[PDB]
């Protein structure tokens, strides 16, 4: 049972708030921990859906996407990482939806683009749609599920939103 | 409520069973298969003593069934053959075979 | 020896399960000559079925047993016969499934269960 | 006369119990079972020995092929006796064995028959042998071939001491206060201490810590089968793989079902999952279906099997046949061995993987490895059967080798010369004397301490020594859980009395009323069970009846059932009315809809009372009355009406450590009606009662006065020191 | 909640496939020629944490278990005062100590936690 005890600065020692900010800044946070439903769903035509809840989010970004995104509409995978994200876990680590959800994730490899809502919606729904070139081979393009399940697992497991490695808990 | 019907219990003698060896023919399917429509007569049944499994193939070869012997059926079943007089005659059961359709 | 005889296969056939001792006692060859050895009785509601053995048989066997229904509808079971490549002939389609148990009213039940005790005690392992 | 029962009646019943059974009954009963029944079967297993000598084709007269058949018959056992150096024979009695350093033993006689078959070896044709000569001396006393000498335990059925009265014991100069239960080897007294073992034919689900990819394991010992689930919880990748004997790489489960005979994919999940609605079960089985769907061929899997054998380069068809035979020969032998039982094996594999996956879905917990209901005790009987089987196998192998040797020289063999009768005698004597439970050549790696020299320092020390059990785990092994006292030891093990040092907790002593089961045949139980309305496992369809109780007999699934309550009531009626002997255990688990029946040997059971609801009194009460106690007093003073009289009337019942999981017991009888602090327990549906709490103690601690006013380690210390007092160890 | 669908021909589970010229989803059996039209764009589902209310498990014939306790609470439906009560039979580590009551006569399930 290894352990580590951290003493805060003289100014922040007597107040709980800076202590909780530091605690959030130390603990290891990964995507698999913050999704109440990171559900692998079929996303054949991301233009429209049957579920009314995500329909509201649809028109938000469809009127909020750049010209390059309009061109890349066809790159979005025929499957979706549909993220019903838990409000409590997201707010626990002081994790803003947009900046943390997309900046680092798209910066890492330019692999996964997202349609994401502002935190005010009652159901925090993100649509994670991976981005691939259209130059993909016909045999490759046929095996959509085969690439995307693997990349989805490598996505949940190997993306670090915030924190330092190997530290399971901070108290 | 005591009304009952009468079915006499008869049997089949040894002279008929000597040249009539019975075998329980069981087909594996999820659908009611009847040989009147699903089998085009005549049918070819052969073995290609229990080492060779049974093969029942239709005249056109569309309906081919392969049958294997399932052992350890501790229930010694009986066959109740209905005669012209409405009586039931007993036939002892010798072997049971289970059939499955070829892919 | 190839064609199947379906001219008289339309009639439904009962599927009854007999106890081991009773079934073995009914495999006797001497009683196979079309002899009338027993009778069945069906209740008006059909819930209770009673098998009564004819008095022509020896008094060493119980003359009363009861029947219980397993499935009210029985499908995808057929009865066939095979005679002298061998010539096969379907007998019919199965209708109901029933199972035989000994009757309490006939005291001979105890006797055979007594023999069952005789079976239990002798064999050891 | 319909009155309730007071503790005085409890002591009356206990007095009857000890007046009927005795304190050393377990050894005597195991020895009687071994001598009467198992000894015959050990030889009847390998009765026939065959030699097939083909024609050497040297000359025309050498074109005849020969067959030699050897068969065995009955076993006869004489009373112990000794032949001196002069050749005179006289019956041996324990005094002479003790004083003269002899060995208390008897002789064994077996019938032997021989047959010779001769056939004309015509090339290209099958050999047709015909009976020509048959030597069988059953009509003469010369047919009994002497085979060896077997030691005899004192006071057993064969021994002269069995029927001796007090004056008989005095004139032969016995101590009347001696109980038997020990051998005399080389003129010294030896005893066999019970050996503890983990039960077989029981599926057990374990768990692993996760530095490794393993997540869960399901074990069964019949030959061992391991069906492991790999993949962490919550991940996409689920793998289920089985490890068959003599197959190294291993292959998935859907491949097993395809090779086994269930081709359609939809039937696989009907085999595995018994509830249609549950979706997590099928979600975890999806990757197995996905991977196993690629190959609809048995023969690729059989080719997998064939390569990993020691022989290499075998033709494909022979590999197919070999892998086919492996399944019916070595895959789950405890269910069946002969051909054509595939449905049972498929359903049992489905049940095993179902239980593993259930534990994987947190609906249940790991199996407890300490539960005393999953442990058997081996007495003298089973150990002797083991050693006798080994030695008989070696002896018959030697006979075959010598007979082949003498056939090579074309010399007739004398059956009284081919047998080396000294093998059995020397092996048994060496094993009993040294204690190393194995062959003389391989005694180093065998079990030790199985046979110990009886301790006669004080009478209570002899009593404590003849009632001892050893748990064969390394006494320096640092596993704390086997050492500690466990909740299942109530009434079957003495909590106070245990050694100190390296054998703390590992050596156990029984209480005053914890007997052990002998063994009985399961076939009549199965026959009756199928008679009274049990549907066989062949005709079982999950969807037609998804609320069906499963039925087990000694750990092999035989089918299902629909109305189990009346079956349990009838079974217990028959067990209480003597139709079945009360050493058989019959548990029902309502929550999982299961029935379990045990008839094996090695189970510890204790007596208990019976509570039944009396409507005339308007509440529950025991079946025992003051009339039965008065009859017991009359019979005891007359020293009829004995303990078996109580047993066969359904007044007491033998309960092991497994049925106890499904009962309720009122400890004092007065607790069943509607200083210290005794609390009124809220229960009102009582089923049994404690005959007396004092019996939860052994023989050593039954001499401390007021033991409950003492700290427990003090009771342990005195239970240790009670074996070093000086006193009259025997009156002779 | 994705449900397995079996082919009507050989009972094998149906694999998804796409129709580009009509842009519609179908389920096909890889062994035969059967093809069926998908009714929803929901084919697979992968939840992570289970927000399942604790369940009493098997209830059938639970009143004949004599090692199960009793209580005198009154039935909310049949107004009977005899019933069996037990804790949640799902063995999660973090399960609360919330009781479950099964009525003796009407076999009605309820809990001691009457949260509105």
From Swiss-Prot, chain A:
Post-translational modification: The tandem 7 residues repeats in the C-terminal domain (CTD) can be highly phosphorylated. The phosphorylation activates Pol II. Phosphorylation occurs mainly at residues 'Ser-2' and 'Ser-5' of the heptapeptide repeat. The phosphorylated form of Pol II appears to carry, on average, one phosphate per repeat. The phosphorylation state is believed to result from the balanced action of site-specific CTD kinases and phosphatases, and a 'CTD code' that specifies the position of Pol II within the transcription cycle has been proposed.
Outcome recorded upon mutating residue 134 to R: Impairs ubiquitination during transcription stress
Compartments in which it is found: Nucleus
Taxonomy, superkingdom: Eukaryota
Residue location of crosslink Glycyl lysine isopeptide (Lys-Gly) (interchain with G-Cter in ubiquitin): 134
Family according to the record: Belongs to the RNA polymerase beta' chain family.
Quaternary structure and partners: Component of the RNA polymerase II (Pol II) complex consisting of 12 subunits. Interacts with DEF1; the interaction is direct and serves to bridge RPB1 to the Elongin complex in a DNA-damaged dependent manner. Interacts with the Elongin subunit ELA1. Interacts with the Elongin subunit ELC1. Interacts with ASK10. Interacts with ESS1. Interacts with RTT103. Interacts with SHE2.
Domain notes for this protein: The C-terminal domain (CTD) serves as a platform for assembly of factors that regulate transcription initiation, elongation, termination and mRNA processing.
Designated name of the protein: DNA-directed RNA polymerase II subunit RPB1
The encoding gene: RPO21
UniProtKB/Swiss-Prot annotation, chain B:
Domain of life: Eukaryota
Protein name listed in UniProt: Transcription initiation factor IIF subunit alpha
Post-translational note: Phosphorylated on Ser and other residues by TAF1 and casein kinase II-like kinases.
Compartmental location: Nucleus
Classification lineage: Eukaryota, Fungi, Dikarya, Ascomycota, Saccharomycotina
Residues of the full protein shown: 95 to 399 of 735
Family statement: Belongs to the TFIIF alpha subunit family.
Note: Present with 1920 molecules/cell in log phase SD medium.
Quaternary structure annotation from Swiss-Prot or TrEMBL: TFIIF is composed of three different subunits: TFG1/RAP74, TFG2/RAP30 and TAF14.
Role description: TFIIF is a general transcription initiation factor that binds to RNA polymerase II. Its functions include the recruitment of RNA polymerase II to the promoter bound DNA-TBP-TFIIB complex, decreasing the affinity of RNA polymerase II for non-specific DNA, allowing for the subsequent recruitment of TFIIE and TFIIH, and facilitating RNA polymerase II elongation.
Swiss-Prot record, chain C:
Cellular component terms per the entry's GO annotation: nucleus; transcription factor TFIIF complex
Subcellular location per the Swiss-Prot or TrEMBL entry: Nucleus
BP GO annotations: regulation of DNA-templated transcription; RNA polymerase II preinitiation complex assembly; transcription elongation by RNA polymerase II; transcription initiation at RNA polymerase II promoter; transcriptional start site selection at RNA polymerase II promoter
GO molecular function terms listed in the Swiss-Prot or TrEMBL record: DNA binding; nucleotide binding; RNA polymerase II complex binding
UniProt entry keywords in alphabetical sequence: DNA-binding, Nucleotide-binding, Nucleus, Phosphoprotein, Transcription, Transcription regulation
Other information: Present with 520 molecules/cell in log phase SD medium.
Similarity remark: Belongs to the TFIIF beta subunit family.
Function according to Swiss-Prot or TrEMBL: TFIIF is a general transcription initiation factor that binds to RNA polymerase II. Its functions include the recruitment of RNA polymerase II to the promoter bound DNA-TBP-TFIIB complex, decreasing the affinity of RNA polymerase II for non-specific DNA, allowing for the subsequent recruitment of TFIIE and TFIIH, and facilitating RNA polymerase II elongation.
Protein name as it appears in the record: Transcription initiation factor IIF subunit beta
Native species: Saccharomyces cerevisiae (strain ATCC 204508 / S288c) (Baker's yeast)
Span of the entire protein shown here: 56 to 249 of 400
UniProtKB/Swiss-Prot annotation, chain D:
Lineage of the species this protein comes from: Eukaryota, Fungi, Dikarya, Ascomycota, Saccharomycotina
Protein role: DNA-dependent RNA polymerase catalyzes the transcription of DNA into RNA using the four ribonucleoside triphosphates as substrates. Second largest component of RNA polymerases II which synthesizes mRNA precursors and many functional non-coding RNAs. Proposed to contribute to the polymerase catalytic activity and forms the polymerase active center together with the largest subunit. Pol II is the central component of the basal RNA polymerase II transcription machinery.
GO cellular component, as recorded: cytoplasmic stress granule; mitochondrion; nucleus; RNA polymerase II, core complex
Catalyzed reaction equations: RNA(n) + a ribonucleoside 5'-triphosphate = RNA(n+1) + diphosphate
EC code(s) of this entry: 2.7.7.6
GO annotation, biological process: RNA-templated transcription; transcription by RNA polymerase II; transcription elongation by RNA polymerase II; transcription initiation at RNA polymerase II promoter
Quaternary structure and interacting proteins, as annotated: Component of the RNA polymerase II (Pol II) complex consisting of 12 subunits.
The protein's name: DNA-directed RNA polymerase II subunit RPB2
Annotated family: Belongs to the RNA polymerase beta chain family.
Region (Fork loop 1): 438-449
Superkingdom per UniProt: Eukaryota
Keyword Nucleotidyltransferase in record: yes
Keywords for this protein: DNA-directed RNA polymerase, Magnesium, Metal-binding, Nucleotidyltransferase, Nucleus, Phosphoprotein, Transcription, Transferase, Zinc, Zinc-finger
Enzyme class: transferase
Span covered, complete protein: 21 to 784 of 1224
């Amino acid at each position: 049972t290894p352990s580590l005890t951290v003493y805060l600065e003289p100014g922040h020692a007597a107040d709980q708030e800076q202590a909780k900010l530091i605690r959030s800044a130390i603990e290891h946070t990964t995507l698999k921990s913050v999704t109440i439903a990171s559900e692998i769903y079929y996303d054949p035509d991301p233009r429209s859906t049957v579920i009314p809840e995500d329909e509201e989010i649809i028109q938000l970004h469809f009127s909020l996407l750049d010209e390059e995104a309009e061109q890349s509409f066809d790159q979005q995978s025929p499957w979706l990482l549909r993220l019903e994200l838990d409000r409590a876990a997201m707010n626990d680590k002081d994790l803003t939806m947009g900046q943390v959800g997309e900046r680092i994730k798209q910066t890492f490899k330019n692999d996964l683009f997202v349609i994401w809502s502002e935190d005010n919606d009652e159901k925090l729904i993100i649509r994670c749609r991976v981005v691939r070139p259209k130059s993909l081979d016909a045999e490759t393009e046929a095996e959509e599920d085969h690439m995307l399940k693997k990349i989805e697992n490598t996505m949940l497991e190997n993306i670090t939103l915030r924190g330092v490695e190997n530290i399971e808990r901070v108290v | 409520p005591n009304e009952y019907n009468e079915f006499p219990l008869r049997a089949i003698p040894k002279e008929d069973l000597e040249n009539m060896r019975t075998h329980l023919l069981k087909f594996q399917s999820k659908k009611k298969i009847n040989p009147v429509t699903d089998f085009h007569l005549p049918v070819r049944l052969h073995r290609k003593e229990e080492f060779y499994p049974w093969v029942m193939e239709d005249f056109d070869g569309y309906n081919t069934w392969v049958g294997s012997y399932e052992a350890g059926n501790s229930d010694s079943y009986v066959l109740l053959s209905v005669e012209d007089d409405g009586s039931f005659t007993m036939i002892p059961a010798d072997k049971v075979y289970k059939f499955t359709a070829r892919n | 020896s190839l064609d199947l005889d379906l001219e008289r296969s339309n009639r439904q056939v009962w599927l009854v399960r007999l106890p081991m001792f009773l079934a073995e006692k009914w495999r006797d060859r001497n009683n196979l000559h079309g002899q009338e050895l027993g009778k069945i009785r069906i209740n008006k509601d059909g819930s209770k079925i009673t098998l009564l053995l004819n008095e022509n048989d020896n008094d060493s066997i119980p003359h009363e047993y009861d029947l219980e229904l397993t499935k009210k509808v029985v499908e995808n079971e057929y009865v066939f016969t095979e005679q002298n490549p061998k010539k096969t002939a379907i007998v019919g389609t199965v209708c109901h499934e029933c199972q035989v148990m000994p009757s309490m009213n006939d005291p001979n039940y105890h006797k055979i269960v007594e023999q069952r005790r005789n079976i239990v005690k002798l064999n050891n392992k | 006369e319909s009155a309730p029962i007071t503790a005085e009646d409890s002591w009356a019943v206990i007095s009857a119990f000890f007046r009927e059974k005795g304190l050393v009954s377990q050894q005597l009963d195991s020895f009687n079972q071994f001598v009467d029944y198992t000894l015959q079967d050990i030889i009847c297993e390998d009765s026939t020995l065959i030699l097939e000598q083909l024609a050497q084709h040297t000359t025309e007269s050498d074109n005849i092929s020969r067959k030699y058949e050897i068969s065995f018959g009955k076993i006869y056992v004489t009373k112990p006796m000794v032949n001196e150096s002069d050749g005179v024979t006289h019956a041996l009695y324990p005094q002479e064995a003790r004083l003269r350093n002899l060995t208390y033993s008897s002789g064994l006689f077996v019938d032997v028959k021989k047959r010779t078959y001769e056939a004309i070896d015509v090339p290209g044709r099958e050999l047709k042998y015909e009976l020509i000569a048959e030597e069988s001396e059953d009509d003469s006393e010369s047919g009994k071939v002497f085979i060896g000498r077997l030691p005899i335990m004192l006071r057993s059925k064969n021994c002269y001491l069995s029927e001796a009265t007090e004056s008989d014991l005095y004139k032969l100069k016995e101590c009347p206060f001696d109980m038997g239960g020990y051998f005399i080897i080389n003129g010294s007294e030896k005893v066999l201490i019970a050996q503890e073992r983990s039960a077989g034919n029981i599926v057990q689900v374990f768990k692993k810590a996760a530095p490794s990819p393993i997540s869960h394991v399901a074990e069964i010992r019949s030959s061992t089968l391991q069906v492991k689930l790999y993949g962490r919880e919550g991940s996409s990748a689920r793998t289920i793989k089985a490890t068959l004997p003599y197959i190294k790489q291993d292959i998935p489960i859907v491949i097993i079902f395809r090779a086994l005979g269930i081709i359609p994919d939809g039937e696989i999940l009907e085999h595995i999952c018994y509830d249609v609605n549950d979706w997590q079960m099928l979600e975890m089985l999806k990757p197995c279906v996905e991977d196993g769907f690629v190959i609809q061929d048995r023969e690729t899997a059989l080719d997998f099997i064939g390569r990993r054998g020691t022989a290499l380069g075998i033709k494909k068809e022979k590999r197919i046949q070999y892998a086919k035979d492996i399944l019916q020969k070595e895959f789950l032998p405890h269910i069946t061995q002969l051909e054509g039982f595939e449905s049972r094996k498929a359903f049992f594999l489905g049940y095993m993987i179902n239980r593993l996956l259930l534990c994987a879905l947190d609906r249940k917990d790991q199996d407890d490895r300490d539960h005393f209901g999953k442990k058997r005790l081996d007495l003298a009987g089973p150990l002797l059967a083991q050693l006798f089987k080994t030695l008989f196998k070696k002896l018959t192998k030697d006979i075959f080798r010598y007979m082949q040797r003498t056939v090579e020289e074309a010399h007739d063999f004398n059956m009284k010369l081919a047998i080396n009768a000294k093998t059995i005698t020397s092996g048994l004597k060496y094993a009993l004397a040294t204690g190393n439970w194995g062959e003389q050549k391989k005694a180093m790696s065998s079990r030790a301490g199985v046979s110990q020299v009886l301790n006669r320092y004080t009478y209570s020390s002899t009593l404590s020594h003849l009632r001892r059990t050893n748990t064969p785990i390394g006494r320096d092994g640092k596993l704390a859980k086997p050492r500690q006292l466990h909740n299942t030891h109530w009434g079957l093990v003495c909590p106070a009395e245990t050694p100190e040092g390296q054998a703390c907790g590992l050596v156990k002593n029984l209480s005053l009323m914890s007997c052990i089961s002998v063994g009985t045949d399961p076939m009549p139980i199965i026959t009756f069970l199928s008679e009274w309305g049990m549907e066989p496992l062949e005709d079982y369809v999950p969807h037609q009846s998804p609320d069906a109780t499963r039925v087990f007999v000694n750990g092999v699934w035989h089918g299902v059932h629909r109305n189990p309550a009346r079956l349990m009531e009838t079974l217990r009626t028959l067990r209480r009315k003597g139709d079945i002997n009360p050493e058989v255990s019959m548990i029902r688990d309502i929550r999982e809809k299961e029935l379990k029946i045990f008839t094996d040997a090695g189970r510890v059971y204790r007596p208990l009372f019976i509570v039944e609801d009396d409507e005339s009194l308007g509440h529950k009460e025991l079946k025992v009355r003051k009339g039965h106690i008065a009859k017991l007093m009359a019979t005891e003073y007359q020293d009829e009406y004995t303990w078996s009289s109580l047993l066969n009337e359904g007044l007491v019942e033998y309960i092991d450590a497994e049925e106890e999981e499904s009962i309720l017991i009122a400890m004092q009888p007065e607790d069943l009606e509607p200083k210290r602090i005794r609390v009124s327990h809220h229960a009102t549906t009582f089923t049994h009662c404690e005959i007396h709490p004092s019996m939860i103690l052994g023989v050593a601690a039954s001499i401390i006065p007021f033991p409950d006013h003492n700290q427990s380690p003090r009771n342990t210390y005195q239970s240790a020191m009670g074996k070093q007092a000086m006193g009259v160890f025997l009156t002779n | 909640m994705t449900t397995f669908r079996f082919c009507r021909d050989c009972n094998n589970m149906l694999y998804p496939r796409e129709d580009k010229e009509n842009n519609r989803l179908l389920f096909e059996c890889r062994t035969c020629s059967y093809v069926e039209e998908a009714g929803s764009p929901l084919v697979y589902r992968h939840e992570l944490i289970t927000n399942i209310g604790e369940t009493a498990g098997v209830v059938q014939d639970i009143g004949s278990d004599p090692t199960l306790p009793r209580s005198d609470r009154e039935c909310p439906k049949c107004h009977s005062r005899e019933n069996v009560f037990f804790q949640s039979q799902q063995r999660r580590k973090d399960t609360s100590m919330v009781l479950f009551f099964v009525c003796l006569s009407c076999s009605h399930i309820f809990t001691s936690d009457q949260k509105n």
